[PDB]
Amino acid sequence: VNIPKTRNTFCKKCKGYSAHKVSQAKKSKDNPRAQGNRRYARKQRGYGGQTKPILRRKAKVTKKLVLNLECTKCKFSHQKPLKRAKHVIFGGERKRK
Amino acid sequence: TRKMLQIIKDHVAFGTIGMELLRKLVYTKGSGRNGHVRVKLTNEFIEDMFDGKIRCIEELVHHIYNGTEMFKKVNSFLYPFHLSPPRGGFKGQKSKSFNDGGSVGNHQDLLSNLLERMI
Amino acid sequence: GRRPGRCYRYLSKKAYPKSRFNRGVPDSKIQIFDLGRRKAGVLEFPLLVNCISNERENLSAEALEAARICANKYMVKHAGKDNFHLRIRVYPFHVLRINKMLLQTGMRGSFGKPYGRAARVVFNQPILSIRTKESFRDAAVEALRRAKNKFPGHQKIQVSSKFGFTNMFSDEFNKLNESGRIILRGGSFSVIREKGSIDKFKRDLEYAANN
Amino acid sequence: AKRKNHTNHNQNRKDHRGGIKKPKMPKFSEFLGLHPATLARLEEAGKLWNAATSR
Amino acid sequence: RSKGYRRGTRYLFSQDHRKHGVAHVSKYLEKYEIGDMVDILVNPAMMKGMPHKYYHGRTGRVYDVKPRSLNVALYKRVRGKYVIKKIIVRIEHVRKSRCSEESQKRILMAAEMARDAESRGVVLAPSKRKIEGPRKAVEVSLDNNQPIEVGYEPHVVIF
RNA sequence: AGUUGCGGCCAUAUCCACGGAAAAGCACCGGAACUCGUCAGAUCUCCGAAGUUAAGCCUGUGCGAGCCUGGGUAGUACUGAGAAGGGAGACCACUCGGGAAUACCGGGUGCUGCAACUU
RNA sequence: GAGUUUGGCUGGGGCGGCACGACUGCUAAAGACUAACGCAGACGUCCUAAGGCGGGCUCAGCGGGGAAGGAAACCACGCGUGGAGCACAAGGGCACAAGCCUGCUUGAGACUGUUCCUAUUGCGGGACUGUUUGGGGGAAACCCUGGCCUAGAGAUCCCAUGUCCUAUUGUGCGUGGGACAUGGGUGACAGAAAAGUUACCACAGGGAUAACUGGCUUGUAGCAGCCGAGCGACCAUAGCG
RNA sequence: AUGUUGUAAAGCACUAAUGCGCUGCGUUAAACUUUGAAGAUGUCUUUUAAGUUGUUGCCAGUGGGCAUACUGUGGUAA
Ligand SMILES: [Zn+2]
């Protein structure tokens, strides 16, 4: 897959069409004060070993490709998912007819 | 009704009957209906069901014999006849077809020499 | 080993031909279907003798090759090499299968593999035919009698009233041959109808008077 | 272990007991997702449906 | 045997031998109204708006009209009862149904003479059809049309 | 009575050979400063009216190829509903119903709608 | 040294294969539905164009011609119903096109509702409407919410990002919680966190299921017939076949 | 009254096969179809025959089947 680096499309802040920049979105860190991590950490103290299963038996190579669309005015972002796509390229070098 | 008879032809015997044998059915084995209830054919029960109309048994027989456009009401007023077996038997396999030598199917105008031994 | 003949005698509902889903099929054992002089003219051999089927069954490719040799050798010894034309009329298109239990798997996975070939045959179908002269009649009726000892079941031998291998009755062919409507070239024939251009119709009359 | 897989035997006799009944068509007030051009003339559009499925 | 949407339709969705090509123009000029009967009949050359193969050859009743489309209502059997279904079909897979031609020209003439009877006062509604009856009578004549003498005729064979 | 403009149904209208045609039309046809487009005014776009019915369009002909519709093939092949029929089987028969298909023969060869114009 | 686990289908089980999720043609008996460790194949991808729209064109192949030029180079005339192409399996579809060349573009926009496969039912994949202080192509009618159509698919609980809200004695907060929408994954694909051995062995059952006899069957095994090409110095049958 | 279908049979118009004669004669098809039944299957009209149901409450057993007439598939066959 080869995708361009800019696009004109609708911005929900400006409420019209403008120019955006394109890149790939990614996951941040988990933080230790969210109530799920709080709950999981008090359960693992003391004696007992592993509580809470962890997955073996995996089958998948790819992940969905999710785009980041960043408006050059108002600096507003929105995300957008696409299909599986092993390889991704954002620069270019368009294939010539 | 001719198509419907083509569907049940391996279980019944059908055909044509004259007027002297039709009078001998209704006077010997005839009854009426009050709706699921079986009543005897008297002159008084006949007037109550056909008010300004038929008043005797001989009038019922002469509407059936012709078309006469009272056919449908007179035929629904009658109760089915329950006959005996024929004296002498059947003379055949009896589940064979008539044109093949049995008793089931169309006897067209020779139906009278089986029906007269069952009354 | 070649299983006995009673294992593949009777017809399945559908034929199983060699074609592009099958691909592993052995070659047919009969390769010649036309013997004798085979280039004679249509007027030369007027008589036709057939062998007709009284069964519905398969005919092995081995039985067709064995009956051809048996019938050719008799006509060459009693009639003469250039005095008959013999034709086989069946062609074995159907393929046979075997399940091949050589301690094996049993009835598990039992769709079988290609084994041999046969021709399918129906009531009143011809199997062998001979056209010859009117004098070698008893030689042709005796050659075909020896050859149906190679086939299973019942078959009949008939002398027909058609003209040779034309598929046309003897007396219709004759009164069209007197009106000059039959073009006779080496081996084959042709009829002339009253259907096309009038110019094209009258060249045909000129061919049918010379050729 | 190894048993039968599938049959339609007896299933026509079950489906036919008590007849095979038909419901009744709605009354045109029950249809959803109608176009705005029909919502305008709703009074005389219901006449065409209600008088054809109950005629 | 698998269960995709166009499962097992090699012969059902095919053109019919020197009848290829896209829909003709008169198929866009028909006028549809609420309450009409229509036949569903797929054209395999038009990809859009087509219904499932179950409905090919069924007759339905129109309950709404869109700018490019129709809504049709009809019955489907599911093992022991019937159920109402709502189909969305484009105008290219539909044609007017002639299934009510007999019943409409008969009910028209009935009300025709009804108005022509009230004009004269003498009227009567009952005009039911009747089934074909036994047989009337015949008067066959042999002044011409001489008989032909048929029979059993012995059996012949040619081979 | 026709032709032309815009059509519906889409071969009885298509394909191949020869011929005909009054008035209009429809064309072919003469050019390149402007508009537009090419290697090329051949096609496409602009401006014209000397010439010609040679072609295209329209109409006739042909024991013409195709297509359309009938007959024969034939009450044949196959088949819905039955019955303790025959046969080692493969399969054949009987009663009441429905019913095809090449090869061969005959006849046909567009039908219509709205508008403008022509002695 | 302790506690525990070491799937299923299956012409017995095991080894092998996957008929365990899912697409196309046939088996399938002219509406739909219809089985086998039945037959023949394909799937976990690929594409900023191979997506959208405007315009102009005609393909495989054949016939007659042209310096070096040959079986195959390129120019060019007359024909060509598709006999070619259209990411991939197969089927269906298509000619002033859905194929080839070419111009401009990011509709592969933001939201919202009805319906089909499809039901007693979730997820998923398609079809059709509406609303926009919204686009692209085109003179315009008109078309466009990915790929010519039928495959390319992932719950509960938890975490990450965005929009709208919020912590009950009052007010804030560099500390948290929620609704809705997307992504992180369970291929045994309605989704446990899991290695072997027992001939030292145990218990609940099973003729729903093997290892001996009987019964049905006869491929294989054994024993027989029919034909008449040849052999037998001559001579088909003395004997052979 | 008016729609839908591609089997049996048959056939060579397309795809795949098959012998000769130098235009005809000969042989084929579950994954071929120019044709094409018997039978099935939609809708309108009781203003056709013949006949005479609607709504809802609380709940059980069952989810190893087998035979046969006609009709298929695998198997030499049972
Ligand atoms: Zn912005």
Curated annotation (Swiss-Prot), chain A:
Single biological process term from Gene Ontology: translation
Gene3D superfamilies registered for this protein in UniProt: 3.10.450.80
Keyword Ribonucleoprotein on entry: yes
Spans annotated as Disordered: 21-55
Name by which UniProt lists this protein: Large ribosomal subunit protein eL42
InterPro entries: Ribosomal_eL44, Ribosomal_LSU_eL42, Ribosomal_zn-bd
MF terms (GO), sorted A to Z: structural constituent of ribosome
GO cellular component: ribonucleoprotein complex; ribosome
The keyword Ribonucleoprotein is annotated on this UniProt entry: yes
Record-stated family: Belongs to the eukaryotic ribosomal protein eL42 family.
Keywords for this protein: Ribonucleoprotein, Ribosomal protein
Source organism of the structure: Encephalitozoon cuniculi (strain GB-M1)
UniProtKB/Swiss-Prot annotation, chain B:
Domain of life: Eukaryota
Family of the protein in this entry: Belongs to the universal ribosomal protein uL30 family.
Name by which UniProt lists this protein: Large ribosomal subunit protein uL30
Lineage: Eukaryota, Fungi, Fungi incertae sedis, Microsporidia, Unikaryonidae
Gene name per UniProt: RPL7
Residues of the full protein shown: 121 to 239 of 239
Swiss-Prot record, chain C:
One term under GO cellular component: ribonucleoprotein complex
Lineage of the organism: Eukaryota, Fungi, Fungi incertae sedis, Microsporidia, Unikaryonidae
Keywords: Ribonucleoprotein, Ribosomal protein
Gene Ontology molecular function terms on file: structural constituent of ribosome
Gene that this polypeptide is encoded by: RPL10
Biological processes annotated in GO: translation
UniProt name for this protein: Large ribosomal subunit protein uL16
Assembly mode: Component of the small ribosomal subunit. Mature ribosomes consist of a small (40S) and a large (60S) subunit. The 40S subunit contains about 33 different proteins and 1 molecule of RNA (18S). The 60S subunit contains about 49 different proteins and 3 molecules of RNA (25S, 5.8S and 5S).
CDD domains tied to this protein: Ribosomal_L16_L10e (cd01433)
Family per similarity comment: Belongs to the universal ribosomal protein uL16 family.
Matching InterPro entries: Ribosomal_uL16, Ribosomal_uL16_CS_euk_arc, Ribosomal_uL16_dom, Ribosomal_uL16_euk_arch, Ribosomal_uL16_sf
Superkingdom of source: Eukaryota
UniProtKB/Swiss-Prot annotation, chain E:
UniProt keyword Ribosomal protein, yes or no: yes
Alphabetical keyword list: Ribonucleoprotein, Ribosomal protein
A cellular-component GO term for this protein: ribonucleoprotein complex
InterPro entries (UniProt xref): Ribosomal_eL21 (IPR001147), Ribosomal_eL21_CS (IPR018259), Ribosomal_eL21_sf (IPR036948), Translation_prot_SH3-like_sf (IPR008991)
Keyword Transmembrane helix: no
Pfam family, one: Ribosomal_L21e
Biological process terms in GO annotation: translation
MF annotations from Gene Ontology: structural constituent of ribosome
UniProt similarity note: Belongs to the eukaryotic ribosomal protein eL21 family.
PANTHER family: 60S RIBOSOMAL PROTEIN L21
Name of the protein this chain belongs to: Large ribosomal subunit protein eL21
